[PDB]
């Protein structure tokens, strides 16, 4: 599985020096699962990318764990090297039509499942099958409060 770093759902941060990720509790005194999520150290292009283990948690990982427990699956969370959703784009010199990011990772067979806050789109559904949405929303405008 390949997951994109999004603050509401994927809290990506470096793991503890002991090699694992420290476990804390929420406001209502319940532990939060924090699986080890290996990925690139620097998201900036043209940087010495290293597959250091990061710690990512949130709501999407909890839903993924529930699905794994219900269908006897396993978790192999790995951050996307591109750091983007990776939709359809025009390649250089008009070589061919292909996909990058999570969509390209799924198409290439490296990851057989995508657990990320990715909305349903026509061109995405043309080549990638999508299940029933787990939440419904519509994009809005963000402006600094003053």
């Amino acid at each position: 599985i390949v997951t994109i770093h999004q603050e509401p759902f994927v809290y990506v941060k470096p793991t503890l020096s002991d090699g694992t990720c420290k476990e804390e509790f929420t406001v209502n005194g319940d532990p939060v699962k924090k699986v080890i999520c290996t990925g690139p150290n620097d998201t900036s292009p043209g940087s010495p990318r290293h597959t250091v283990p990061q710690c990512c948690y949130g709501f999407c990982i909890d839903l993924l764990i529930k699905l794994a427990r219900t269908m006897n699956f396993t978790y192999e969370v790995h951050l996307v090297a591109d750091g983007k959703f990776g939709t359809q784009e025009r390649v250089n010199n008009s070589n061919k039509k292909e996909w990058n990011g999570m969509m390209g990772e799924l198409l290439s067979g490296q990851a057989d499942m995508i657990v990320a806050p990715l909305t349903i789109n026509n061109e995405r559904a043309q080549y990638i099958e999508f299940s029933k949405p787990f939440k419904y929303q519509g994009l809005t405008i963000l402006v600094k409060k003053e």
């Binding site: 770093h5 999004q6 603050e7 509401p8 759902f9 929420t26 406001v27 209502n28 319940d30 998201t43 900036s44 949130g58 709501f59 909890d62 839903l63 529930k66 699905l67 219900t70 269908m71 750091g83 983007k84 959703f85 990776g86 939709t87 359809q88 784009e89 999570m102 969509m103 799924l106 057989d112 499942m113 995508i114 657990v115 990320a116 806050p117 990715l118 909305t119 349903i120 789109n121 026509n122 061109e123 990638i128 099958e129 999508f130 299940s131 029933k132 949405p133 787990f134 939440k135 419904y136 929303q137 519509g138 994009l139 809005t140 405008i141 963000l142 402006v143 600094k144 409060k145 003053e146």
Partner: protein
């Protein structure tokens, strides 16, 4: 008249309807607003063919990440930002210094990427329906999506307090000098 001029000409901070905002229809350089990358926002902009050139002029660049975009918006570098409503409202709940404005347009839900040949699509859909049925998903959402008289009047109150204390301090010595002159 002062009260009327205070109630009018206020700082309403237009709620920027977005797709229906007349000021966004004119791509003014003084108001810069763009998405992050080629993601679903850019897909929708390209799909909408009526104002493809307007959308391209609005973007004018691609930001590295949503976190960097939100940091730029917080630093007032970007006048406005467009992204999924859930992320924006979660950021607003985390920090009240960022506010979400505009109605809901293009209400498209999320999903789970999966191969067509993968036989787990039915299992995933049924599990999602079961989760929506039970309170486990509702409680998880509540835990993960639900979180937590004016500057000008306080400032003017402080200013008038300083003025009155300075006035009484000066009038003390003024009256002392007046009394000394009268009672030489």
């Amino acid at each position: 008249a002062n009260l009327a001029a205070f109630l009018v000409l206020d700082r309403p901070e237009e709620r920027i309807t977005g797709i229906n905002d007349p000021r966004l229809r004119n791509p003014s350089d003084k108001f810069i607003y763009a998405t992050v990358k080629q993601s679903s926002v850019d897909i929708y902009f390209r799909r909408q063919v009526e104002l493809s050139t307007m959308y391209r002029h609005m973007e004018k660049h691609n930001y590295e990440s949503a976190a960097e975009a939100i940091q730029a918006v917080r630093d007032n570098k970007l006048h406005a930002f467009i992204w999924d409503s859930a992320v924006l409202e979660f950021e607003a709940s985390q920090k009240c210094d960022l506010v979400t404005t505009g109605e809901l347009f293009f209400r498209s839900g999320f999903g789970i990427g999966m191969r067509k040949d993968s036989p787990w699509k039915q299992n995933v859909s049924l599990s999602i329906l079961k989760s929506h049925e039970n309170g486990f998903m509702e409680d998880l959402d509540k835990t993960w999506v639900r979180y937590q008289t004016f500057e000008n009047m306080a400032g003017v109150f402080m200013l008038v307090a300083g003025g009155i204390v300075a006035g009484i301090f000066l009038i003390f010595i003024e009256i002392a000098y007046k009394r000394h002159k009268d009672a030489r």
